[PDB]
Enzyme design. Structure first.
Site, PDB file in Angstrom:
ATOM      1  N   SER A  36     -14.511 -10.566  16.680  1.00 24.45           N
ATOM      2  CA  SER A  36     -13.150 -10.983  17.016  1.00 24.45           C
ATOM      3  C   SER A  36     -12.666 -12.168  16.200  1.00 24.45           C
ATOM      4  O   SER A  36     -11.489 -12.522  16.309  1.00 24.45           O
ATOM      5  CB  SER A  36     -13.039 -11.385  18.483  1.00 24.45           C
ATOM      6  OG  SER A  36     -13.000 -10.247  19.322  1.00 24.45           O
ATOM      7  N   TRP A  53     -10.824  -5.592  27.864  1.00 18.35           N
ATOM      8  CA  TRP A  53     -10.705  -7.023  27.586  1.00 18.35           C
ATOM      9  C   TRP A  53      -9.397  -7.335  26.859  1.00 18.35           C
ATOM     10  O   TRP A  53      -9.362  -7.890  25.750  1.00 18.35           O
ATOM     11  CB  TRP A  53     -11.928  -7.603  26.873  1.00 18.35           C
ATOM     12  CG  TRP A  53     -13.232  -7.297  27.526  1.00 18.35           C
ATOM     13  CD1 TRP A  53     -13.754  -7.873  28.652  1.00 18.35           C
ATOM     14  CD2 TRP A  53     -14.199  -6.349  27.073  1.00 18.35           C
ATOM     15  NE1 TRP A  53     -14.995  -7.336  28.926  1.00 18.35           N
ATOM     16  CE2 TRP A  53     -15.292  -6.404  27.962  1.00 18.35           C
ATOM     17  CE3 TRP A  53     -14.254  -5.472  25.983  1.00 18.35           C
ATOM     18  CZ2 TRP A  53     -16.424  -5.602  27.805  1.00 18.35           C
ATOM     19  CZ3 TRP A  53     -15.369  -4.671  25.830  1.00 18.35           C
ATOM     20  CH2 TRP A  53     -16.445  -4.743  26.733  1.00 18.35           C
ATOM     21  N   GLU A  76     -13.981  -0.605  17.566  1.00 19.70           N
ATOM     22  CA  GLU A  76     -14.959  -0.034  16.641  1.00 19.70           C
ATOM     23  C   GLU A  76     -15.528  -1.068  15.677  1.00 19.70           C
ATOM     24  O   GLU A  76     -16.672  -0.933  15.226  1.00 19.70           O
ATOM     25  CB  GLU A  76     -14.310   1.103  15.851  1.00 19.70           C
ATOM     26  CG  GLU A  76     -14.033   2.368  16.658  1.00 19.70           C
ATOM     27  CD  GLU A  76     -12.716   2.357  17.446  1.00 19.70           C
ATOM     28  OE1 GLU A  76     -11.883   1.432  17.286  1.00 19.70           O
ATOM     29  OE2 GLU A  76     -12.517   3.301  18.238  1.00 19.70           O
TER      30      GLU A  76
HETATM   31  O1  6YV Z   1     -14.123 -14.147  21.153  1.00 17.88           O
HETATM   32  C1  6YV Z   1     -15.229 -13.743  21.666  1.00 17.88           C
HETATM   33  O2  6YV Z   1     -16.254 -14.428  21.766  1.00 17.88           O
HETATM   34  C2  6YV Z   1     -15.279 -12.278  22.139  1.00 17.88           C
HETATM   35  C3  6YV Z   1     -14.462 -11.394  21.770  1.00 17.88           C
HETATM   36  C4  6YV Z   1     -14.516  -9.978  22.168  1.00 17.88           C
HETATM   37  C5  6YV Z   1     -14.589  -9.633  23.534  1.00 17.88           C
HETATM   38  C6  6YV Z   1     -14.630  -8.300  23.939  1.00 17.88           C
HETATM   39  C7  6YV Z   1     -14.598  -7.290  22.992  1.00 17.88           C
HETATM   40  C8  6YV Z   1     -14.522  -7.612  21.642  1.00 17.88           C
HETATM   41  C9  6YV Z   1     -14.487  -8.944  21.203  1.00 17.88           C
HETATM   42  B1  6YV Z   1     -14.434  -9.243  19.668  1.00 17.88           B
HETATM   43  O3  6YV Z   1     -15.461 -10.108  19.261  1.00 17.88           O
HETATM   44  O4  6YV Z   1     -14.140  -8.300  18.733  1.00 17.88           O
END
Ligand code: 6YV
Length: 264
Positions: A44, A79, A142
């Site tokens: 993310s 989320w 993905e």
């Molecule tokens: O910012 C974070 O620590 C978590 C982000 C997140 C949460 C759920 C699903 C995908 C992501 B991301 O990292 O792509």
């Protein structure tokens, strides 16, 4: 031999994987580097650069940031707490950007990615600021697969830090947009246990986290303003060799401490 690097090697061995660190003191030019040019999954953390790309576009489009977006339930992703909350009201481009940065909101990120022309559009923005390492290839969720040896959806700690510097402190964005990017990063809610845990309480911090989950893969990058001093920019990325290996926030904080201690 590299004595500066030995505490980082000890940390990653205790962690059971690989840690990549790059930190720059913008006042002195001093740096700390450990696996700084290796690729790690963005997870993310791409959402910060996404927000900067949206801000860059808003410089030529009057009122873009203030434009309301009335997405439907089909835009929602697991989320997406802000997007779900505002589903019945809509959100502006600025509010989607802040949700992507400050809550890692997945629906908001994908909506903004679509406006920019997808992962290739965000990658093209990063190329336009001189970042030749960053690549985004897929969308949420993905892009979190974090497969060892897969270059999709990766960058390096050094390239992340250099791009962060250009966008938050340099001239890659016009001044009002640079300040908005900084304001969004300083309001992040997801990073209290990462770089923020490494910095003295009175210092200002803007950061963006990433957590792929699989392969012990998680990260954080930050601009840090020590009180009365020139800012520090740094990135800490982790990965591990087995799919079920767990990421560690404490390891990210510990690497960030070593980086701050190692700076001149
Ligand atoms: O910012 C974070 O620590 C978590 C982000 C997140 C949460 C759920 C699903 C995908 C992501 B991301 O990292 O792509």
């Amino acid at each position: 031999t590299n004595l500066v690097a030995e505490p980082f090697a000890k940390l990653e061995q205790d962690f059971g994987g690989s840690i990549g660190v790059y930190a720059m003191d913008t006042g002195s030019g001093a740096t700390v580097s450990y696996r700084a040019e290796e690729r790690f999954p963005l997870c993310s953390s791409f959402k910060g650069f996404l927000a900067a790309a949206v801000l860059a576009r808003s410089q030529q489009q009057a009122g873009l940031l203030d434009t309301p977006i009335r997405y439907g339930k089909n835009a929602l992703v697991p989320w997406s707490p802000i997007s779900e909350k505002y589903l019945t009201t809509g959100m502006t481009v600025a509010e989607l950007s802040a949700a992507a940065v400050q809550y890692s909101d997945n629906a908001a990120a994908n909506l903004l990615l679509k406006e920019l022309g997808g992962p290739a559009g965000l990658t093209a923005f990063m190329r336009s600021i001189g970042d030749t390492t960053f690549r985004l290839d897929r969308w949420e969720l993905e892009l979190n697969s974090a497969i060892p040896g897969d270059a999709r959806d990766t960058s390096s700690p050094r390239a992340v830090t250099e791009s962060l510097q250009k966008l938050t402190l340099g001239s890659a964005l016009a001044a009002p947009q640079r300040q908005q990017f900084v304001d969004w990063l300083k309001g992040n809610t997801t990073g209290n246990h990462r770089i923020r845990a490494a910095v003295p309480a009175d210092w200002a911090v803007g950061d963006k986290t990433g957590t792929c989950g699989v392969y012990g893969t998680a990260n954080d990058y930050a601009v840090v303003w020590p009180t009365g001093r020139a800012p520090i920019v740094l990135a800490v990325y982790t990965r591990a060799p087995n799919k079920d290996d767990k990421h560690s926030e404490a390891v990210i904080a510990a690497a960030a401490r070593l980086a701050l201690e190692g700076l001149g």
